[PDB]
Design an enzyme around this catalytic site. Structure first.
Site, PDB file in Angstrom:
ATOM      1  N   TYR A  40       0.195  -1.727  13.686  1.00 33.56           N
ATOM      2  CA  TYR A  40       0.796  -2.065  12.405  1.00 33.56           C
ATOM      3  C   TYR A  40       0.399  -1.055  11.341  1.00 33.56           C
ATOM      4  CZ  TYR A  40      -3.709  -3.813  10.823  1.00 33.56           C
ATOM      5  OH  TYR A  40      -5.027  -3.922  10.461  1.00 33.56           O
ATOM      6  N   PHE A  48      -2.292   0.423   2.474  1.00 33.27           N
ATOM      7  CA  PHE A  48      -3.658  -0.069   2.391  1.00 33.27           C
ATOM      8  C   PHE A  48      -4.312  -0.300   3.741  1.00 33.27           C
ATOM      9  CE2 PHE A  48      -1.118  -3.910   2.600  1.00 33.27           C
ATOM     10  CZ  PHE A  48      -1.825  -4.700   3.469  1.00 33.27           C
ATOM     11  N   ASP A  49      -3.550  -0.349   4.830  1.00 35.07           N
ATOM     12  CA  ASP A  49      -4.131  -0.563   6.146  1.00 35.07           C
ATOM     13  C   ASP A  49      -3.209   0.012   7.207  1.00 35.07           C
ATOM     14  OD1 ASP A  49      -5.917  -1.320   8.059  1.00 35.07           O
ATOM     15  OD2 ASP A  49      -5.372  -3.441   8.053  1.00 35.07           O
ATOM     16  N   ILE A  66      -3.389 -13.745   8.543  1.00 36.17           N
ATOM     17  CA  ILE A  66      -2.698 -14.440   7.472  1.00 36.17           C
ATOM     18  C   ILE A  66      -1.492 -15.204   8.025  1.00 36.17           C
ATOM     19  CG2 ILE A  66      -3.494 -12.948   5.630  1.00 36.17           C
ATOM     20  CD1 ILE A  66      -0.876 -11.389   5.916  1.00 36.17           C
ATOM     21  N   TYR A  99      -2.160 -13.710   0.696  1.00 39.44           N
ATOM     22  CA  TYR A  99      -3.486 -13.883   0.119  1.00 39.44           C
ATOM     23  C   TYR A  99      -3.495 -14.743  -1.134  1.00 39.44           C
ATOM     24  CZ  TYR A  99      -5.755 -10.694   3.326  1.00 39.44           C
ATOM     25  OH  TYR A  99      -6.286 -10.119   4.453  1.00 39.44           O
ATOM     26  N   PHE A 113       4.719  -5.031   6.028  1.00 33.13           N
ATOM     27  CA  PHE A 113       4.053  -4.561   7.231  1.00 33.13           C
ATOM     28  C   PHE A 113       5.083  -3.979   8.180  1.00 33.13           C
ATOM     29  CE2 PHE A 113       0.781  -7.398   5.725  1.00 33.13           C
ATOM     30  CZ  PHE A 113      -0.375  -6.737   6.063  1.00 33.13           C
TER      31      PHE A 113
END
Ligand SMILES: Nc1ncnc2c1ncn2[C@@H]1O[C@H](COP(=O)(O)OP(=O)(O)OP(=O)(O)O)[C@@H](O)[C@H]1O
Lengths: 806, 48, 107, 144
Positions: free
Chosen positions: C26, C36-37, C56, C82, C99
């Site tokens: 991902y 961010f990831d 999540i 979140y 994502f």
């Protein structure tokens, strides 16, 4: 990126066929995926240029261009009326795949540096023949005119049988027989009329050219000896070409030049007529479709056709010359093209600043692959990118096009180079001298000195530097592989010079002058522009005023100036669904922000544009006007049409100061300031404008998350030009509240130090990558098309400036 | 939004055929054009 | 809620079921496009068991909505990702997450 | 040419006669090249032939060249300088000492024949002496 619906949507994958159709009439661009329509279109975009097919990619891809004909067979039928792209290749070119705007290439001995490429313009396909209707033929000219129309046919027929052509009752390509092959009266009158009008036209063309023709002898014109016709020469009809024959006539370089001009005008007139009739260009002839391989302006024609036309015209020029009529090529009027800005045109490549040498004896080589405008030498680390090399005190260079040494001007020096010549550049920082060699031979000035420059102050050191003009190619060898140097041993090794990069374990990094305009803070010492930060008074908000320092005086610089503010306002991620004192609740809950521009009296409002720009505005247009703003509409629809959305995208949202000039005041210098206020609703995407209080009719709609910089484009006409006023209105917040988080709820106008005025600079220094993608392009075959391959990955560590989205 | 951001990104390049078409009043160029691109191989994630 | 948009087709039949260990690759971004990831930066597929409340809620639903070998874009609202708290120092409060997930295998 | 230039530098009648002749005959040395010591054909020809001489000496001999110039500045004779070079022929520049000599020797050995030469100490004591003498006198001539 806007998602677009299609059957079985998926990111481009192997065995996918993308069909692209461009209709310049709408204009519109549409796609098809594996034959299925893509439910989305681009439309209403700018048309001030030429379009080309393009594919962009990263490493790990293999694709094939299919262009029709013998250059890739289509897998799907082009929609009715659309032409295969292979037909657009110009007469003097050969189809192939190429990179775009490359400043560097591979070559037999290493990388080649490449200067800017000269490009065509959409207006280069408009034939522009000289007016020849107001012209009235002189009586003597008219007498030869009748003979010209028919006699030209005579020479043609002699050439046509020489072509093997014989009269054809019916035209046939296998026959090589022409119905239009016959006598001038025998030939159909409408076709004959075009011939007769042409012969008269040549005389009028000469009169327009300004060359003057009067017959020195009438008797010489009377004497004619037309060549006889052989029987094989005669057409099936039996007509025999009888061009008049004139062996005696001779030409002069000016006269031959005037015949080349005559052939250009004739072809352009023919092209204009055919375009009016409705013809167009096509690499493959199609008479039923009115497409011709020769329908381009004379300049772009292939050499063979140019030669043929020049031959016909020179034969005709000679017949008039021999009659006795005098042809005097018209005087030549000095002309300058100045296609681009010289200060920003030639591409400069220099070594990185950290390599500057402050001592020793250093040597490098520069091979001139072409023989045009190219300069090579030594530059100081603070070299500027927008100044011609050697035009100031920051570089000592040699220009081998004509032979010159450039430093604070030009002086004759050396001799012109030739293709393949290697210029050796030596700097001696012990003697403070610079030496240039050409193929190992030291170049000498007129005085005989063997040093191009002397008494050089070392200062901060020197870097190898070169400058390539449009269409030039060079090879810079800094000497990492001392074996590669071609004349170092011959001259420089014994004298004690070391190759510049002799003991560097890695190739020397280079920077180049990139011609992409970028916004930069107005220099504190700019010779012409000054920005003053005015504090807010009891009745005035904070301001940023621009003044022209050298207005009126000589050496004044007057050109379009593009200004923006250093910080943007950002529209919200999600848009809202569907006394004269501020009201506390209203001002604390408003999402509308305001800022104004004051155009001082004496500054022409017609020379001012006020509004916003996005982070991607890069147009340094010296003839700017609102019609030049980039714009495009993206329309997404359903599977049976039914447009579902239509978004307009641009990078410049502005109003013209001329829209607010009263018709009565128009034509008179006003004595009042013009204040244009801009309002943006960050929660709805709406942008509106007011002029001196009154609301204007211009409004714009943007999308969420858009970034807008306040901007002003102005052509100064006064010493006081404009003033950014960062104030507010009743119940409307100032720009500081939108720009700074800590001031989000502060209604007091502010102008913190970060907020400053930036101007658009045309050129900047940019670091060339050490490695480049290895792309292989070839022709897979007559059916497969043109293959593009890229397999080896390449990555870079990017540093991103958030507010500038760059 | 305040600190400078960094990331590893792919180099991207463009390729074109030498085909140039436009529009102008009185131009000799046709108006409607068509072409195709066939994808033979594509590695979705050759790099990160 | 989570919206799923196919990028590349999967097999079409094999879907994750509760208690299975999904292996994915991902890349995560904020709605404004800021990364961010990414598991590909670490060069190691991310494994998580469906139904154990490890990831999540948006992920739990979206990946379950996918098939083996499929690549898809998941758009997840704040309440599913979140919420108000966010991820201190990584994800701002009330942030929508995009994502780019790929379901490599099921185990 | 170097021997002639050495004679020119040593003698003083030579310089006077050359300067006279050029001034009297109005011979423009610049005409041939393209009145002054720089313009002197005697030194110009030597400076144009010098590279052929420096090419004789391998870079390893640069140290011996400095040493020979140092004595000749001490005013020794040719046989003397040759003897000192013969004896302390062990003060040659070493390759590992500095990288510059590395690429210099690379070029030198790449040049054919040069690699085969520089193998007999008589060759070195001769060439270093000659080239050092020429460079010495060039140094004095250029110096005030
Ligand atoms: N490309 C052109 N440029 C200039 N003049 C042209 C051109 N084509 C045709 N003409 C004019 O039209 C005349 C045509 O007469 P000609 O009998 O020689 O040709 P044709 O066999 O009828 O061929 P075409 O089909 O090219 O008109 C030429 O002599 C010239 O006057």
């Amino acid at each position: 990126a806007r998602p677009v619906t299609s059957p079985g949507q998926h990111l481009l994958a192997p065995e996918d066929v993308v069909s692209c159709c461009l209709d310049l009439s709408v204009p519109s661009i549409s796609f098809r995926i594996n034959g299925c329509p893509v439910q989305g279109v681009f439309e209403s975009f700018n048309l001030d240029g030429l379009f080309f097919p393009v594919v962009s990619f990263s490493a790990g891809i293999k694709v094939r261009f299919l262009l029709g004909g013998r250059h890739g067979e289509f897998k799907f039928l082009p929609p009715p009326g659309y032409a295969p792209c292979h037909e657009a290749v110009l007469p003097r070119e050969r189809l192939h795949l190429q990179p775009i705007k490359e400043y560097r290439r591979e070559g037999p001995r290493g990388p080649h540096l490449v200067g800017p490429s000269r490009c065509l313009s959409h207006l280069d396909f408009v034939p522009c023949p000289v007016d020849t209707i107001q012209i009235v033929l002189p009586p003597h000219l008219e007498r030869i005119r009748e003979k010209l129309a028919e006699n030209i046919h005579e020479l043609w027929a002699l050439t046509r049988i020489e072509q093997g052509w014989t009269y054809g009752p019916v035209r046939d390509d296998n026959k090589r027989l022409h119905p239009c092959l016959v006598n001038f009266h025998s030939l159909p009158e409408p076709e004959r009329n075009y011939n007769l009008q042409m012969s008269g036209e040549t005389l009028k063309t000469l009169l327009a050219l300004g060359c003057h023709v009067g017959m020195a002898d009438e008797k010489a014109e009377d004497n004619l000896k037309k060549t006889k016709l052989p029987k094989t020469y005669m057409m099936s009809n039996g007509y025999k070409p009888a061009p008049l024959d004139l062996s005696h006539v001779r030409l002069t370089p000016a006269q031959t030049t005037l015949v080349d001009r005559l052939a250009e005008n004739g072809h352009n007139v023919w092209a204009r007529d055919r375009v009016a009739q409705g013809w167009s260009y096509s690499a493959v002839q199609d008479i039923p479709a009115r497409r011709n391989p020769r329908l381009v302006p004379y300049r772009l024609l292939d050499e063979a056709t140019k030669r043929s036309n020049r031959d016909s015209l020179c034969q005709a020029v000679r017949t008039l010359l021999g009659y006795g009529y005098n042809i005097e090529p018209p005087d030549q009027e000095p002309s300058q093209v100045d296609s681009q800005s010289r200060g920003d045109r030639a591409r400069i490549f220099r070594a990185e600043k950290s390599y500057a040498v402050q001592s020793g004896r250093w040597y490098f080589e520069f091979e001139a692959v072409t023989t045009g405008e190219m300069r090579v030498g030594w530059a100081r680390p603070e070299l500027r990118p927008d100044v011609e090399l050697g035009a100031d005190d920051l570089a000592y260079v040699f220009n081998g096009h004509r032979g010159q040494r450039w430093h604070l001007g030009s002086e004759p020096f050396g001799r012109p180079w030739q293709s393949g010549d290697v210029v050796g550049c030596m700097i001696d920082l012990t003697e403070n001298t610079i030496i240039f060699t050409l193929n190992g031979e030291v170049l000498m000035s007129d005085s005989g000195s063997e040093t191009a420059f002397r008494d050089i102050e070392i200062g901060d050191g020197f870097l190898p530097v070169c400058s390539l003009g449009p269409g030039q190619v060079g090879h810079l060898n800094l000497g990492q592989d001392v074996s590669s140097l071609r004349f170092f041993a011959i001259c420089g090794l014994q004298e004690g010079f070391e190759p510049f990069a002799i003991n560097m374990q890695r190739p020397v990094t280079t920077w180049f002058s990139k011609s992409l305009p970028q916004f930069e803070p107005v220099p504190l010492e700019h010779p012409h522009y000054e920005v003053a930060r005015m504090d807010g008074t009891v009745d005035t908000p904070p301001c940023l005023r621009l003044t022209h320092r050298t207005w009126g005086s000589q050496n004044s610089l007057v050109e379009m100036l593009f200004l923006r503010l250093s910080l943007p306002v950002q529209f919200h991620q999600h848009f809202r669904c569907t006394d004269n004192r501020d009201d506390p609740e209203i001002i604390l809950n408003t999402t509308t922000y305001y800022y104004s521009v004051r155009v001082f009296a004496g500054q022409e409002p017609s020379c001012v544009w006020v509004g916003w720009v996005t982070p991607d505005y890069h147009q340094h247009d010296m003839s700017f006007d609102l019609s030049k703003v980039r714009a495009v509409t993206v329309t997404m629809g359903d599977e049976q049409g039914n447009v579902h959305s239509s978004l307009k995208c641009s990078n410049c949202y502005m109003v013209w100061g001329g829209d607010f000039v009263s018709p009565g005041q128009q034509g008179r210098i006003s004595h009042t300031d013009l204040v244009i206020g801009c309002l943006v609703d960050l929660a709805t995407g709406l942008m509106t404008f007011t002029a001196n209080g009154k609301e204007s009719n211009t409004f714009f709609q943007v999308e969420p998350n858009t970034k807008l910089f306040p901007a002003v484009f102005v052509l100064p006409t006064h010493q006081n030009v404009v003033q950014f006023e960062l104030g507010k209105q009743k119940n409307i917040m100032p720009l500081s509240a939108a720009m700074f988080l800590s001031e989000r709820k502060n209604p007091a106008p502010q102008c913190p130090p970060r907020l400053e005025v930036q101007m658009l600079m045309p050129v900047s220094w940019s670091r060339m990558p050490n490695h480049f993608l290895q792309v292989d392009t070839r022709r897979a075959g007559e059916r497969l098309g043109w293959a593009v391959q890229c397999q080896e990955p390449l990555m870079m560590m990017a540093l991103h400036i958030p507010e500038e989205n760059r | 939004e305040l600190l400078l951001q960094t990331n590893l990104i792919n180099y991207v390049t463009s390729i074109r055929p030498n085909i140039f078409v436009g529009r102008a009043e009185g131009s000799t160029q046709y108006g409607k054009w068509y072409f195709e691109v066939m994808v033979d191989e594509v590695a979705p994630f050759l790099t990160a | 809620g989570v919206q799923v948009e196919t990028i590349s087709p999967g097999d079409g039949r094999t879907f994750p079921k509760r208690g299975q260990t999904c292996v994915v690759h991902y890349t995560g971004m904020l709605e404004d496009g800021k990364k961010f990831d990414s598991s590909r930066d670490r060069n190691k597929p991310f494994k998580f068991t469906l139904g154990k409340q490890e990831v999540i809620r948006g992920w739990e639903e979206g990946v379950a909505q996918m098939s083996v070998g499929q690549r898809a874009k998941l758009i997840i609202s704040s309440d599913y990702a979140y919420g108000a708290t966010g991820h201190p120092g990584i994800i701002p409060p009330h942030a929508t997450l995009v994502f780019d997930v790929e379901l490599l295998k099921l185990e | 040419v170097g021997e002639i230039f050495i004679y020119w530098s040593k003698s003083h009648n030579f310089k006077r006669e050359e300067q006279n002749f050029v001034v009297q005959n109005e011979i423009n040395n610049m005409s041939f090249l393209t009145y002054s010591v720089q313009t002197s054909l005697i030194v110009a020809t030597l400076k144009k032939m010098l590279p052929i001489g420096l090419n004789m000496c391998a870079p390893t001999d640069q140290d011996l060249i400095v040493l020979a110039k140092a004595r000749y500045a001490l005013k020794d004779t040719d046989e003397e300088v040759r003897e000192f070079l013969q004896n302390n022929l062990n003060l040659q520049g070493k390759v590992e000492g500095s990288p510059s000599l590395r690429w210099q020797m690379a070029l030198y050995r790449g040049v054919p024949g040069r690699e085969e030469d520089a193998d007999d100490p008589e060759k070195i004591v001769r060439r270093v002496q000659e080239v050092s003498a020429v460079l010495y006198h060039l140094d004095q001539t250029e110096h005030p």
